[PDB]
C-alpha cells in the first residue's frame, strides 16, 4: 500500500493529481529489513 | 538581514537565498532606510524607467542559473538593504518578501 | 501618483486600528493596491491587495482578521484592524502594484501564473500602539 500524496497540492491549477508522490515499505538487500522508498507515480497508475 | 560588505568601485553580484523551482518572475527592491522601497528591476531583467541603466539582472533561461543581481558601479551612499521577490511556477503564491541584503562600502 | 497616508501613529492594544491612504493625480479604477507593514527587527511582511472585483486577498500569517476597504468617494485607502496585539508597532507603507502575467507553457491548458510588481511607494506613515 502507498502512502501518495499530491505533487503540487496548493501550488497550480485546480489542486488536480495529475502526479502523485507515493512512499512505500520496501525490503533493500536484506529480506528482514524494510526501508521506506518513495517514487512519483501518475493517476492512471494508482488505486484508492 | 544579512551581512555583505563592499566597497566603491567593483562591481557587485548579490543573490538570493530562495532557490527556483520553475520558471522564475523575480523583482528587485531597494529599502533606503527613511525613503520609500523603489522597485530596481522585474521580470528578471524589466527595469522601469528611471532606475539607472547599470543594474542588470539574470534573465531566465535554461532553467538552473541562479537569479542574482549585479550592482556594477556601485556608488558611496548604497547603505540599503534589498530585496529579492522569488515568484516560480511550482511554489505558488509568494507572500512572503523574502530576506533583505545589508549594503556596506 | 504619490499617495498620502495620513497615519495617527497612537492606538491603544485590543482597538481599532485605522491609516487612511490618499491616491493624488489620478483616480484608481484599473490600478492593484497593496499594503505592506514593516516592523522593526525584520523585513517588510506583504499583507494583502485589493482590485476589479473588490475581493481583496489577505496574507495567510494575518488571519485574515484585517481588512482594507478601498474607497471611491474621498479616493482613499483605509485599514480596519481588529483584535490588534500591543506587538504590532510597525511603520505601514502604502503603495500599488501591476498584474503581469509569466508564461511557460500552452496557455490553453492553463501554464501561467500571475506576478505583481509594486511600481510606485508612499512613505509610508508609522504608527505604534500604546
Ligand atoms: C503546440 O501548440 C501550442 C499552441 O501554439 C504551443 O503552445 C505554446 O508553446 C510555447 C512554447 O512553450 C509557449 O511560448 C511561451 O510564451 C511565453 C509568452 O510569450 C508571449 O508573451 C511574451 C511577453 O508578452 C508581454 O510583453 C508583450 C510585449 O513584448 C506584451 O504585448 C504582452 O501583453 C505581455 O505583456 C512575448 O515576448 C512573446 O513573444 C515571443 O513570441 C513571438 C511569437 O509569438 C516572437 O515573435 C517573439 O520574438 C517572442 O519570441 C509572446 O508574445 C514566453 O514567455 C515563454 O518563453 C519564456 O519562458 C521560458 C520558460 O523558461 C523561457 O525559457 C524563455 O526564454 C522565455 O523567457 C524569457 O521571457 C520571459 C518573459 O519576458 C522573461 O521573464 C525571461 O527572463 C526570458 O527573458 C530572457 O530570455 C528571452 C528568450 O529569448 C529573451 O528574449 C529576453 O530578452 C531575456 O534574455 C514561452 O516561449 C506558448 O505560450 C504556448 N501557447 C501559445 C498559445 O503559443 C505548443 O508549444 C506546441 N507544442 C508543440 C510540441 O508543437
Ligand atoms: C515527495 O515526497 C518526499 C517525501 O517522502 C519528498 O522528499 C523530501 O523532500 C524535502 C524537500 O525537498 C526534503 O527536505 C526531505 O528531506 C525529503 N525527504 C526524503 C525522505 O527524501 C520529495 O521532495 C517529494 N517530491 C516531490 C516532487 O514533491
Ligand atoms: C512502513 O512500515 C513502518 C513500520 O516499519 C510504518 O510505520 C509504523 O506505522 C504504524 C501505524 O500504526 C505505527 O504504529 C508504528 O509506530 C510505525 N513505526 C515506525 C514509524 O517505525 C509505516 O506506516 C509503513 N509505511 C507504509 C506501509 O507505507
Known amino acids: 500500500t502507498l502512502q501518495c500524496t499530491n505533487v503540487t497540492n496548493n501550488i497550480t491549477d485546480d489542486m488536480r493529481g495529475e502526479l502523485k508522490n507515493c512512499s512505500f515499505n520496501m525490503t533493500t538487500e536484506l529480506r528482514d529489513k524494510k526501508q521506506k522508498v518513495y517514487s512519483l507515480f501518475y493517476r492512471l497508475d494508482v488505486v484508492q | 538581514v544579512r551581512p555583505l560588505s563592499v566597497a566603491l568601485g567593483e562591481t557587485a553580484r548579490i543573490s538570493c537565498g530562495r532557490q527556483a523551482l520553475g520558471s522564475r518572475a523575480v523583482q528587485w527592491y531597494q529599502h533606503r532606510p527613511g525613503q520609500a522601497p523603489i522597485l530596481l528591476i522585474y521580470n528578471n531583467q524589466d527595469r522601469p524607467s528611471g532606475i539607472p541603466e547599470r543594474f542588470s539582472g539574470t534573465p531566465d533561461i535554461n532553467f538552473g542559473t541562479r537569479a542574482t543581481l549585479t550592482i556594477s558601479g556601485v556608488e558611496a551612499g548604497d547603505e540599503a538593504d534589498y530585496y529579492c521577490h522569488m515568484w516560480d511556477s511550482r511554489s505558488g503564491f509568494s507572500w512572503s518578501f523574502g530576506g533583505a541584503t545589508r549594503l556596506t562600502v | 501618483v504619490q499617495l498620502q497616508e495620513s497615519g495617527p501613529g497612537l492606538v491603544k492594544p485590543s482597538e481599532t486600528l485605522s491609516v487612511t491612504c490618499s491616491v493624488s493625480g489620478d483616480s484608481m479604477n484599473n490600478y492593484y493596491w497593496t499594503w505592506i507593514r514593516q516592523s522593526p527587527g525584520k523585513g517588510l511582511e506583504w499583507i494583502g491587495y485589493i482590485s476589479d472585483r473588490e475581493s481583496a486577498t489577505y496574507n495567510p500569517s494575518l488571519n485574515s482578521r484585517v481588512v482594507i476597504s478601498r474607497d471611491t468617494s474621498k479616493n482613499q485607502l483605509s485599514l480596519k484592524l481588529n483584535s490588534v496585539t500591543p506587538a504590532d508597532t510597525a511603520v505601514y507603507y502604502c503603495?500599488?502594484?501591476?498584474?503581469?502575467?509569466?508564461?511557460?507553457?500552452?496557455?490553453?491548458?492553463?501554464?501561467?501564473?500571475?506576478?505583481?510588481?509594486?511600481?510606485?511607494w508612499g512613505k509610508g506613515t508609522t504608527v505604534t500602539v500604546s
Open positions: 503603495a500599488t502594484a501591476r498584474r503581469g502575467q509569466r508564461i511557460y507553457g500552452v496557455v490553453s491548458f492553463g501554464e501561467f501564473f500571475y506576478y505583481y510588481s509594486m511600481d510606485v
